[PDB]
Design a protein around this ligand. Structure first.
Ligand SMILES: CCCC(=N)C1=C(O)C[C@@H](C[C@@H](C)SCC)CC1=O
Ligand SMILES: CCCC(=N)C1=C(O)C[C@@H](C[C@@H](C)SCC)CC1=O
Ligand SMILES: [Co+2]
Ligand SMILES: [Co+2]
Lengths: 377, 377
C-alpha cells in the first residue's frame, strides 16, 4: 500500500556530505577504498576561504567531504560577501559537530523540483529549519531542515557541474577508479525513540511507511528515496548495538549508508583486495552452514557457483516475496563504532527496478542465529 | 665545529605524533601513500576509553596518529585511574590543537637515556614544561616540554613493544608495505622570530648550531637529531611561504618532516604510482635545464643514467664539501598549505654515515632560479 502522499515532488538522492576534520585525508581514503573518482573541488585554490570541500563520484553516487579552514582567513567576510560555496556552512557548527560526533554524515541531500517550495512546505508541516533557501548563481537552490540529531535533510533543485563555485578536477589528479558502485540505495538513522522520529519526518515530508532494535522505513512516492530509522531495545543479554551507537556518537545520527553495486561480486573483490592497504574492512563472514542453507532459500535464483562466490566474499542473501537481496557490511568507517557502509545488489521486481526490491535483510537475523547454532553442531 | 654541549644524553629520533580528528582515516591514507605498515594500536579494543592511537612503521621511522573519543566515555576517570596509554593526552588540548592548526605534528619524540633527568635538566635550563615525567608499567618514562607553537619535544627512555598499553597489530590487518623509507632525518619548525626560538631551544638542550626565509639548524652531539628552524623574510615580491604557513597554521608549528630512504628512486617510483589513488602528490618538477646543469655539478657522483632517473622522478640534487643530497618535496599533507614531507637520500661522509651529510639543499635556491631563467631561454 503506497498512498503517494509526498507533500512536494522528490526526485532522487543527490549527495551525502561528511563533516571532517581534514577533508583531504578522508576523501583520499574513501576514494581508494570504495573506487570513487575525484570529480569536483571547492577550496583555497578555487577562492573559497571558508571551507575545503571535495566531491567523489561513482556512477550517480556523490560523496562530499568538507572541513573548515581557520576562521581567520575569512574574518573580514559577512554572509553577503562570503567566499563559501555552500552558504549553509558555519565554522562553529562544523567544529561542534565533529567534536561531538567525530567523522560522520552531516547532510542527506535529495534533489527536488523546487527547493524553496520544499523548504516552505516542510516547515509549514513541522520541520525544524536549519538553513533557509539560498539561490546560487541564479542556477541552483539549496535549503536544509533538521532530520535527526545533528543530521540535516538538504533539498537541492536545479533550474536546468555539482554546485556553482565548485571546479571540475584536473584529469591528472582524477584517476578513473570504479569498483562497480552506482547509487545510494538507502540511508539509515539511529535515534533514542523511533515513534517520535517517524512522526516528525513523515509529518513534514509525506513519506509513507514502507534483535536489539525496532525499525521502520520511510519512502518517497516512487520509493526511490528510502530512509530507515532504528531505535534500541533495552534489557537484552547482548547489549543493543543501536544503544552502543548512541553512546559513542553522543546521540542520534546516521548509522549506515547502503550503496548499490551493479556487480556486487566485483565490488567486493576490489574492496577486499584493499582492506589492508588503506581501504575498508568487512564484518566477519557467516559460517559455512549459512551458505549450505542458501541452497534451500535462494537455490532458484543463484547457481551453486554463484552461491560459492557469495561464500568466498562473505556476502549475505535475503529474499522477500518480490525479490532477492545481496548485501554485506563494512566495519566502522572511522575511529568510533558509529557509521559504517553496506554494499547491496537487488535482483527482481522488474517493470527499471522498483525501489526496495527484496527488502532490507530482516530475514538474516534469524538465518544468522540459526546458522551459528547449526555450525556449533 | 661541534662543541658536544648536550646537557643530557640523546640517542635518536623515536617517533612523530600527529594529532588528528579521525586517526583511522589519516593513518590508512599515510600507510598507503608512504608504504608504512600498521604495527601497534591503543584504542577501545585495547581498553583505552580516552584516545584512539595507531602506530605506523617503516624501518626505524615511527608515525603515531591520535584522536580523542567522546569525553563521556571516560567521564568517571581521574588521572590516577586513566585508561589512556599516553598519559600526557588531554581531550581539550587535542581538540583545541586541531581546531586551531588542523592536521599536524603535536610531538617530536626523541629517545634519551633518562627522560626524568632530561626533563629536569631541560626545565632547569629554561624549557617550558608541558607534561611531567610519568613512568609507564615500570618500563618506560615519558616527559614533554614546549618546542615551538603548540609542538612539544617528547623525551622517551626505556629501562631495557612501542609503549605499555599498546598492542601489536594482528598480521591479517598488518600488510607488509615498504617503499624504502627507513628513518627520520630532520624535522623543521616555522616560527615568527628565529633568534628567540634558537636561544630558547639551544638554551635548554645544549644542541649546537649545525629567499623568503632565514634559517638555522640545531643538532645533538653526534648530529643525528637535527632540528632546523625557519623565520619569514618580509617585503619580497613573492610572498614568503614561511609567512603563508604562519597565517594558515595560526602561528608557529612543524613545517616539514624529512624521511630518509635507502633507495630514493624506488621510493619515488612507488609513491608517484599512488599519488592519484589515495597517496601523496609532489611539487612540480624542475625544468629540463636543471637536469642538464646537473652534469657539471654532480656528474662525478651520479652516472648519466642515474641523472636521467632523477629527471623522470623530479628529484633535486645538491652538494656541499662533504657529501651529496638527493631530495624531493610533497605537496601539503592535508587541507591547509602547512605541513609537507621531504624524501631524501644522502651519499658520502662514510666513517656509518655522519649526520647531515650534504647539508639540507640550500644550494638549490640559486640552482632552481638559474634553471628557471635559463629554461625561459
Ligand atoms: C534500518 C533497518 C533497515 C536496514 N537497512 C537493515 C539493515 O541493513 C541490517 C539488516 C540486519 C542484518 C543484515 S545484520 C547481520 C550481519 C536488517 C535491516 O533491517
Ligand atoms: C629549514 C632549512 C633546512 C631545510 N630542511 C631546507 C629544506 O629542506 C628546503 C631547501 C630549499 C629547496 C630545496 S626548496 C625548492 C624545491 C633548503 C633548506 O634549507
Ligand atoms: Co541496510
Ligand atoms: Co629539509
Amino acid at each position: 500500500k503506497n498512498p503517494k502522499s509526498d507533500k512536494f515532488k522528490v526526485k532522487r538522492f543527490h549527495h551525502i556530505e561528511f563533516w571532517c576534520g581534514d577533508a583531504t585525508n578522508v576523501a583520499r581514503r574513501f576514494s581508494w577504498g570504495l573506487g570513487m573518482r575525484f570529480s569536483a573541488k571547492s577550496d583555497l585554490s578555487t577562492g573559497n576561504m571558508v571551507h575545503a570541500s571535495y566531491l567523489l563520484t561513482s556512477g550517480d553516487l556523490r560523496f562530499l567531504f568538507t572541513a573548515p579552514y581557520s576562521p581567520s582567513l575569512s574574518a573580514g567576510e559577512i554572509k553577503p560577501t562570503t567566499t563559501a560555496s555552500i552558504p549553509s556552512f558555519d565554522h562553529g557548527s562544523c567544529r561542534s559537530f565533529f567534536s561531538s560526533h567525530g567523522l560522520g554524515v552531516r547532510a542527506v541531500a535529495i534533489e527536488v523540483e523546487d527547493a524553496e517550495s520544499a523548504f516552505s512546505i516542510s516547515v509549514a508541516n513541522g520541520a525544524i529549519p536549519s538553513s533557509p533557501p539560498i539561490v546560487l548563481n541564479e542556477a541552483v537552490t539549496i535549503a536544509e531542515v533538521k532530520l535527526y540529531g545533528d543530521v540535516v535533510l538538504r533539498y537541492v533543485s536545479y533550474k536546468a557541474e555539482f554546485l556553482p563555485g565548485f571546479e571540475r578536477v584536473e584529469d591528472a589528479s582524477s584517476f578513473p577508479l570504479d569498483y562497480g558502485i552506482r547509487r545510494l540505495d538507502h540511508a539509515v538513522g539511529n535515534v533514542p525513540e523511533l515513534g517520535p522520529a517517524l512522526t516528525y519526518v513523515a509529518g513534514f515530508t509525506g513519506f509513507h511507511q514502507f534483535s536489539g532494535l525496532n525499525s521502520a522505513v520511510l519512502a518517497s512516492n516512487d520509493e526511490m528515496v528510502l530512509l530507515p530509522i532504528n531505535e534500541p531495545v533495552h534489557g537484552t543479554k547482548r547489549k543493543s548495538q543501536i544503544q552502543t551507537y548512541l553512546e559513542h556518537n553522543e546521540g542520534a545520527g546516521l548509522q549506515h549508508l547502503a550503496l548499490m553495486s551493479e556487480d556486487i561480486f566485483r565490488t567486493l573483490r576490489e574492496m577486499r583486495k584493499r582492506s589492508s592497504i588503506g581501504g575498508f574492512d568487512f564484518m566477519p563472514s557467516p559460517p559455512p552452514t549459512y551458505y549450505q542453507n542458501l541452497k534451500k532459500r535462494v537455490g532458484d535464483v543463484l547457481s551453486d557457483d554463484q552461491i560459492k562466490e557469495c561464500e568466498e566474499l562473505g556476502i549475505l542473501v535475503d529474499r522477500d516475496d518480490q525479490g532477492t537481496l545481496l548485501q554485506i557490511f563494512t566495519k566502522p568507517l572511522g575511529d568510533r563504532p558509529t557509521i559504517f557502509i553496506e554494499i547491496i545488489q537487488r535482483v527482481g521486481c522488474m517493470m527499471y527496478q522498483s525501489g526496495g526490491c527484496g527488502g532490507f535483510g530482516k530475514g538474516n537475523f534469524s538465518e544468522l542465529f540459526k546458522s551459528i547454532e547449526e555450525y556449533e553442531k
